[PDB]
Write a protein that binds this DNA or RNA. Structure first.
Length: 108
RNA sequence: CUAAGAAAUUCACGGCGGGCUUGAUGUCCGCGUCUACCUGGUUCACUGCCGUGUAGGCAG
């Protein structure tokens, strides 16, 4: 999203910490609204916003700058495959690599 | 029907200042190298003559 949206994403990630409010932003009414200090209708509208932000909310489409390669079928036509950059996977491999390269274990 | 398909890096520049590397030294004892072979495989594509001839042959 936009970087101003990433500010609200950091706020939501900070709200997830400490209590069980990361899974309890949606699944709670009294403990959520009493801490939020809003009306019950406003609390329901706020819970719907977090439920929508957790969901995808994207129409299925690709772009012209993406890859969309052809794979051949066994004795048949072809299929289009649009490969997506795995971001969580490289973040995990990057965490493992920066752990292996530097730590008190690695430096020791 | 290829993580497909596309692309201008680039302009300019002072690295130089100077210097003692020295003294000293035991390489050394000992040793069985042997046995057996066809340089020819056409291996010297030569030398001279008749013929104007490079054309063609001759003689050793």
């Amino acid at each position: 999203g936009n970087a101003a949206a990433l500010d609200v994403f950091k706020f939501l990630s900070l709200q997830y910490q400490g209590k069980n409010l990361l899974n309890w932003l949606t699944e709670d009414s009294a403990e959520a609204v009493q801490a939020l200090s809003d009306n019950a209708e406003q609390a329901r509208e706020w819970r719907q916003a977090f439920i929508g932000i957790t969901a995808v909310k994207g129409a299925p489409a690709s772009h012209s700058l993406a890859k969309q390669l052809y794979f051949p079928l066994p004795g048949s036509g072809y299929h289009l495959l649009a490969p997506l950059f795995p971001t969580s996977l490289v973040h995990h491999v990057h965490a493992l690599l920066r752990e292996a390269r530097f730590g008190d274990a690695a430096k020791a």
